Amino acid sequence: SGFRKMAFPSGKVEGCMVQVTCGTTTLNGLWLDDVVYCPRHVICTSEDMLNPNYEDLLIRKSNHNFLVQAGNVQLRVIGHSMQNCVLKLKVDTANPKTPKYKFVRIQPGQTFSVLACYNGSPSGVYQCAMRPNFTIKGSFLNGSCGSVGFNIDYDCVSFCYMHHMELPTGVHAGTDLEGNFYGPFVDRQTAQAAGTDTTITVNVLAWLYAAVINGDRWFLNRFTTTLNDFNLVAMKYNYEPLTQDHVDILGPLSAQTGIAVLDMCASLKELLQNGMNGRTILGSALLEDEFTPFDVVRQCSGVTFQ
Amino acid sequence: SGFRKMAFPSGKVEGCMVQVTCGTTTLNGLWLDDVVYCPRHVICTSEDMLNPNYEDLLIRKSNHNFLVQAGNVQLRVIGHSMQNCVLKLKVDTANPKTPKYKFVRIQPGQTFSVLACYNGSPSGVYQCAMRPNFTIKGSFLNGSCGSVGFNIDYDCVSFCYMHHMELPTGVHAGTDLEGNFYGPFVDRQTAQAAGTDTTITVNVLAWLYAAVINGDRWFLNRFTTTLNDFNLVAMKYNYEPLTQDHVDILGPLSAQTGIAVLDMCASLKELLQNGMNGRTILGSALLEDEFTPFDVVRQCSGVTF
Numbered sequence: 001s002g003f004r005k006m007a008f009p010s011g012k013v014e015g016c017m018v019q020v021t022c023g024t025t026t027l028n029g030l031w032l033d034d035v036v037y038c039p040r041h042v043i044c045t046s047e048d049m050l051n052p053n054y055e056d057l058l059i060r061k062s063n064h065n066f067l068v069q070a071g072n073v074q075l076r077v078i079g080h081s082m083q084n085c086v087l088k089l090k091v092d093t094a095n096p097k098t099p100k101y102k103f104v105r106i107q108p109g110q111t112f113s114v115l116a117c118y119n120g121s122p123s124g125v126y127q128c129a130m131r132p133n134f135t136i137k138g139s140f141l142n143g144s145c146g147s148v149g150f151n152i153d154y155d156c157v158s159f160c161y162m163h164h165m166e167l168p169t170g171v172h173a174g175t176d177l178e179g180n181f182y183g184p185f186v187d188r189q190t191a192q193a194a195g196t197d198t199t200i201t202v203n204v205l206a207w208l209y210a211a212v213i214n215g216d217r218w219f220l221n222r223f224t225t226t227l228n229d230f231n232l233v234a235m236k237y238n239y240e241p242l243t244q245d246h247v248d249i250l251g252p253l254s255a256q257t258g259i260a261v262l263d264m265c266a267s268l269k270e271l272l273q274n275g276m277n278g279r280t281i282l283g284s285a286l287l288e289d290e291f292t293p294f295d296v297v298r299q300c301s302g303v304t305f306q
Numbered sequence: 307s308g309f310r311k312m313a314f315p316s317g318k319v320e321g322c323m324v325q326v327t328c329g330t331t332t333l334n335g336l337w338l339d340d341v342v343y344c345p346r347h348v349i350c351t352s353e354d355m356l357n358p359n360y361e362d363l364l365i366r367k368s369n370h371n372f373l374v375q376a377g378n379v380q381l382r383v384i385g386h387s388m389q390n391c392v393l394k395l396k397v398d399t400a401n402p403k404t405p406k407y408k409f410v411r412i413q414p415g416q417t418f419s420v421l422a423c424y425n426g427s428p429s430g431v432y433q434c435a436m437r438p439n440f441t442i443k444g445s446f447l448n449g450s451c452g453s454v455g456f457n458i459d460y461d462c463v464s465f466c467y468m469h470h471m472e473l474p475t476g477v478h479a480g481t482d483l484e485g486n487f488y489g490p491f492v493d494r495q496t497a498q499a500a501g502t503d504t505t506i507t508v509n510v511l512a513w514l515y516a517a518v519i520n521g522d523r524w525f526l527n528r529f530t531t532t533l534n535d536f537n538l539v540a541m542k543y544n545y546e547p548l549t550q551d552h553v554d555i556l557g558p559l560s561a562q563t564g565i566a567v568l569d570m571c572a573s574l575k576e577l578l579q580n581g582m583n584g585r586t587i588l589g590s591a592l593l594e595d596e597f598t599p600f601d602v603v604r605q606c607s608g609v610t611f
């Protein structure tokens with residue numbers, strides 16, 4: 001029993017974190033095999049930020065303008081290349097701590113663990129979701145660029161996020177590990193703003209199923225809804241459209257609880273209309289949308305508390 | 307910017323988790339130096355747990371009755387003994403990944419990170435607090451006994467919790483690493499209940515300071531109060547008393563924000579008496595009480611390990 005924002009154990013990723021310095025700019029890198037990955041804005045200067053020409057900035061660098069430090073050991077850079085918004089530094093030693101890993105670009109609504117790091121050293125670990133507007137609501141201070149997000153289903157690390165920027169609203173933007181930004185953002189300090197964000201509907205339904213699995217049914221009702229009518233209502237509360245894909249993805253939780261997906265949709269409609277009237281759901285007074293269906297099956301018992 | 311419930315990096319503890327099997331029972335153990343630590347109820351059958359005599363049960367077991375697995379490697383048990391509710395299994399090899407560590411017993415209100423483990427294999431990490439009623443609101447399934455809670459204080463892992471039981475209400479109870487239970491619980495399979503819980507006042511104040519650091523400040527007001535008057539209000543709303551020691555512990559956050567503790571106390575008093583509007587604080591509609599003052603400092607300052 002219980003239900004918390006549960007991150008993956010971070011040790012497999014801690015063993016990959018290094019410090020990268022170019023000029024007076026220092027941030028984090030990710031050391032996998034004999035390559036160190038980091039944001040390309042490590043090569044920018046304080047004046048370079050509005051409209052940097054990264055190709056022109058990079059050709060002026062030699063391998064030895066990059067200082068990479070793994071703990072108290074300096075790594076020797078023997079090559080460098082730019083891939084989209086990520087810099088790839090080839091080093092003379094493979095990381096002996098490299099886990100099994102892959103790179104995956106995730107969809108809005110997917111969740112992942114973030115290992116926040118400063119000067120190549122880890123500070124803390126927490127769960128995040130890719131918002132519908134392609135930002136993440138992280139906890140990052142100056143020096144955190146190069147921190148990564150990941151999942152570790154099975155024993156394989158799936159790297160999905162590298163942190164590049166904090167936006168004026170206080171949310172965060174970054175890339176996959178191929179250097180392609182999530183969303184419309186670009187790595188320069190020009191005015192940019194994330195779109196209006198929405199609530200991840202499939203995730204709220206997953207979390208309501210978690211509540212039922214753990215023994216709570218007070219919010220259910222005797223009604224149902226069509227998918228079309230549910231989306232018509234949900235849209236008025238700034239919820240994302242629920243698709244047939246999402247209904248399919250919720251199938252396992254529906255099967256375990258005996259609650260048809262569209263019947264849980266009717267419960268959500270009523271919660272949006274009524275509020276919680278002093279009650280809570282899994283400890284929250286607001287509807288939670290950063291647990292995916294997969295996250296719920298990962299954490300909850302396979303046996304409903306009936 | 308931003309503020310999240312944040313756990314310590316778990317790598318130093320991951321290297322310490324092992325699987326312990328006795329008879330048909332498997333759970334987790336903590337491997338430090340040449341000793342594995344786990345709950346003593348590992349030696350019970352289900353009927354044993356109904357009313358266990360642990361010293362008598364342990365007498366009937368030898369070293370080879372304990373099967374200890376570190377990953378794929380089998381560890382050779384060379385001794386065994388109990389300390390309070392914890393079994394100590396001496397093994398023939400010291401853990402080469404043993405971090406600098408110590409054993410600490412925490413006070414209610416203190417937070418810690420939990421590394422939830424199954425079959426000796428870490429599966430997740432999350433942040434908990436020791437509740438005033440000495441339970442923790444964890445997230446644990448069968449097989450999780452022996453998972454540990456910890457803080458990292460500079461270079462040193464301070465282990466403070468080992469998981470033993472889930473209570474009927476779904477909260478959790480465990481011991482320090484010397485086997486002393488937190489709370490009025492015993493390791494026997496029987497109906498046990500925690501007392502009515504209360505809210506951790508100093509932690510709610512720390513989180514209001516975190517909200518002001520992050521620019522969320524609608525709840526500040528012109529009023530101040532006294533420690534005595536505030537404690538009358540805390541008692542009425544089932545909040546823990548606020549001591550002068552708590553005021554001093556909030557010192558650094560009061561210094562970072564410039565807002566005196568008794569100033570903030572008048573804000574919290576008005577929130578307790580009137581609620582929020584339809585308003586939130588740091589995204590929450592409830593007053594959060596599982597961030598300590600030091601938790602707020604370390605997250606907002608970027609302290610590393």
Ligand SMILES: CCCOc1cc(Cl)cc(-c2cc(-c3ccccc3C#N)cn(-c3cccnc3)c2=O)c1
Pocket residue numbers: 025026027041049140141142143144145146164165166167168186187188189190192307
């Ligand atoms: C769109 C508005 C912001 O546009 C940009 C554009 C670019 Cl190219 C980079 C940054 C950025 C740089 C830097 C930075 C700078 C110098 C040395 C080191 C670093 C680092 N570490 C930090 N942080 C930051 C701060 C706080 C929380 N998280 C990220 C940035 O957002 C910001």
Ligand SMILES: CCCOc1cc(Cl)cc(-c2cc(-c3ccccc3C#N)cn(-c3cccnc3)c2=O)c1
Pocket residue numbers: 001331332333347355446447448449450451452470471472473474492493494495496497498
């Ligand atoms: C107060 C009512 C419960 O009284 C007890 C007393 C004692 Cl001595 C132990 C337990 C207990 C045992 C066991 C257990 C048993 C056999 C083999 C392995 C394990 C394990 N792992 C699991 N879990 C448990 C389950 C879910 C979440 N977290 C903990 C217990 O609470 C429960």
